[PDB]
Design a protein around this ligand. Structure first.
Ligand SMILES: NC(=O)c1ccc[n+]([C@@H]2O[C@H](COP(=O)([O-])OP(=O)(O)OC[C@H]3O[C@@H](n4cnc5c(N)ncnc54)[C@H](OP(=O)(O)O)[C@@H]3O)[C@@H](O)[C@H]2O)c1
Ligand SMILES: Nc1nc(=O)c2nc(CNc3ccc(C(=O)N[C@@H](CCC(=O)O)C(=O)O)cc3)cnc2[nH]1
Ligand SMILES: [Mn+2]
Ligand SMILES: [Mn+2]
Ligand SMILES: [Mn+2]
Length: 159
């Protein structure tokens, strides 16, 4: 099974200038809990944005060019990325925009955080078709002293 995990600001913005400008510790904790002990697939730009391997996960990087770091696994196509995960119950696709586009048609589950924040961005999560997806979990949180925007965790499953 393939799942996508992402945090979206208003208008599906996910990034600006190869960064995420907000800081929501509760959402990073949600990301870690839902990805730990699973393989994670990311594109090269997202690898550079994170800047280090994510511990406790098999890190698989898509790039058309040879890898430059043997602490992670480098692959050259979507099918190779999936194969490199082996026989696991759930593969997590962690972006960015171009990678989400390619894996969305193959995904059974979306883990989305909706952040109540207006962000100028240059990268968006794909338009998906709402009729294709059932909401199976949602949890709203008001802003607090640690998290400066309200946010909603949602899990959707392909109908
Ligand atoms: N809010 C969130 O949840 C979230 C999550 C992830 C990322 N982001 C943000 O998203 C932005 C990065 O997204 P992006 O769309 O620019 O880039 P991306 O999807 O992270 O990376 C694209 C790169 O991945 C490689 N690639 C993708 N598909 C491939 C394929 N089928 N075969 C081979 N290589 C492939 C290519 O690398 P080469 O050029 O080396 O061939 C391509 O240039 C940043 O702003 C980041 O902060 C946000
Ligand atoms: N909901 C969500 N939020 C995100 O921030 C996110 N980020 C990415 C890609 N970028 C990043 C950037 C940093 C870290 C990171 O530092 N993660 C630590 C945090 C642990 C914690 O804060 O409790 C990790 O070990 O996962 C992960 C992904 C992909 N999907 C996402 N999905
Ligand atoms: Mn092929
Ligand atoms: Mn197999
Ligand atoms: Mn806000």
């Amino acid at each position: 099974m393939i799942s996508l995990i992402a945090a979206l600001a208003v208008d599906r913005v996910i990034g600006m200038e190869n960064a995420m400008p907000w800081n929501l510790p509760a959402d990073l904790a949600w990301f870690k809990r839902n990805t730990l002990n699973k393989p994670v697939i990311m594109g090269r730009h997202t690898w550079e944005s994170i800047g280090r391997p994510l511990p406790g996960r098999k890190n698989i990087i898509l790039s058309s060019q040879p890898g430059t770091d043997d602490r992670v696994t480098w692959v050259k196509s979507v099918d190779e990325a999936i194969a490199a995960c082996g026989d696991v119950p759930e593969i997590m696709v962690i972006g960015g925009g171009r990678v989400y586009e390619q894996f969305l048609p193959k995904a059974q589950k979306l883990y989305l955080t909706h952040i109540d924040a207006e962000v100028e961005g240059d990268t968006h999560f794909p338009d998906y078709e709402p009729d294709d997806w059932e909401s199976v979990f949602s949890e709203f949180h008001d802003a607090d002293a640690q998290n400066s925007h309200s946010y909603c965790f949602e899990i959707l499953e392909r109908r």
